[PDB]
Amino acid sequence: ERPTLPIPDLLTTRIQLTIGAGQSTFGGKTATTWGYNGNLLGPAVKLQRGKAVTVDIYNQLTEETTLHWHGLEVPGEVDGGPQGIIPPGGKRSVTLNVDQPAATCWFHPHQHGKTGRQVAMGLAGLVVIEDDEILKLMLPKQWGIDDVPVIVQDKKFSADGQIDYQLDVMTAAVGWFGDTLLTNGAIYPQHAAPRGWLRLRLLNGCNARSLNFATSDNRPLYVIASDGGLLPEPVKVSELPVLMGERFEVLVEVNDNKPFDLVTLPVSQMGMAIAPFDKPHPVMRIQPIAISASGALPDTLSSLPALPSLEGLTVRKLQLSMDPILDMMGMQMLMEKYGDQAMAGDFHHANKINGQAFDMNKPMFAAAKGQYERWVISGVGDMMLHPFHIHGTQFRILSENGKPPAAHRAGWKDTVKVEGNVSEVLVKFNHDAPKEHAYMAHCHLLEHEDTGMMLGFTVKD
Ligand SMILES: [Ca+2]
């Protein structure tokens, strides 16, 4: 027997999110965990393009927190920038006026120095943006039945059953990773899927572990959407790498009564091919049921504007770097504890952008509003994986780590891979972020961000 896959409540849209500590059980041991309106994770907030909703956020924890609307094209005031800290027992109200295509976004704490720990404790929620366009496509759309969110996260636990989180020299170097895989908070759950097409909204919500999705019988995954929404057409893939914080929506066929698994395949990332992730690892069991769903795989999904002329656009260079000491010690501890499988394929300001660890009150530059810019992000100089996330925008990747992006990564993205080479993205910011509410750009390997690999920037007309 497997647990049934939990489905976050879809909150149709004033909304309250109460941030609080509860309890969860994993393999018969109880752990203190944190959730939005629950023990763990959070709801799926449903937003309609062009309609405003106010979100009341109440912090019932005993420590400060913040909330990042990951993927939303909103003013910097929504996250709050440096003015976004919600004290224990405090509250903050924001207004979300969505003006972007349909997409699956998400939200999560984002306080510098504490983001890894607060996500590890359980905090994460979803944002389902809908528009007029996507509803004409007749995709699978019955939430929790044939339209299913899949939030995949690893954790590790102490002997006493508690979540075993630490920001130490080793995790500052390679990230916090564990040996237990959760799917919407459950270990290897099952989902009962109607015959036809099954839509999976995939979110890599790990602190540091990259994932690579596939099916146990290697049937195709039809990618229909990236971080920022629909592709122009479905893209058939046999495997789907997903970086930390990225989302993809895929359709998979359910065409007989035999169960199969969604799995994740071993990645070439420091520390992440350690057992039990040295082999394909099940994510969830898909059990077909003898009732039809009528959702379709459309031949065409959407229209993607042409990349504009790069002639005359501002080019901003961002160099990612890691203190050489941190690299050395952290590497040595990883090798000492886990051996060769770890390579299969002060430290609190040691990770930097442009030679600077994040300074919350000094934005690095002012970006133009409503103008395309080319941002060049280099990881030359270290071998670590850095998924690079830019707030306030959905951008287009021009070069992903020294190569043009894969077709299913060539649409709307808020994250780009950087791993030893150079990426280039085309960004435009439609909304204001003054100094007091600055946007951020940062590595989404959370322990890197927490140890300085983040910058602030403003946006003004
Ligand atoms: Ca509901």
Numbering used by the authors: 30 to 42, 47 to 378, 403 to 518
Recite the paper's sentences.
CueO plays an important role in copper homeostasis by oxidation of toxic cuprous ions to cupric ions. As with all multi-copper oxidases, it contains four copper atoms distributed within one type 1 (T1)2 copper site and a trinuclear cluster comprising the T2 and T3 copper sites. A distinguishing feature of CueO is a partially structured 45-amino acid segment (residues 356–404) capping the entrance to the T1/sCu copper-binding sites. The goal of the current study was to engineer the highly compliant MRS such that CueO activity would be modulated by engagement of a partner protein with a scaffolded peptide.
A panel of CueO variants was generated with differing modifications in the MRS. These included insertion of the parental MDM2-binding peptide sequence present in the N-terminal domain of p53 along with a higher-affinity derivative (peptide 12.1) into the MRS α5 helix to generate CueO-p53 and CueO-12.1-α5, respectively. The results showed interaction with MDM2 only for the CueO-12.1 variant, where the 12.1 peptide replaced residues 384–394 in the intrinsically disordered region of the MRS. Kinetics data indicated that insertions into the MRS primarily affected kcat for syringaldazine oxidation, with no marked influence on affinity. This was most pronounced for the 12.1 and PM2 peptide insertions, reducing kcat ∼2.2- and 2.8-fold, respectively. To gain further mechanistic insights, we determined crystal structures of both the free and MDM2(6–125)-bound forms of CueO-PM2 along with CueO-12.1. However, in the highly similar structures of CueO-PM2 and CueO-12.1 (Cα RMSD = 0.22 Å), the MRS-PM2/12.1 regions were not resolved.
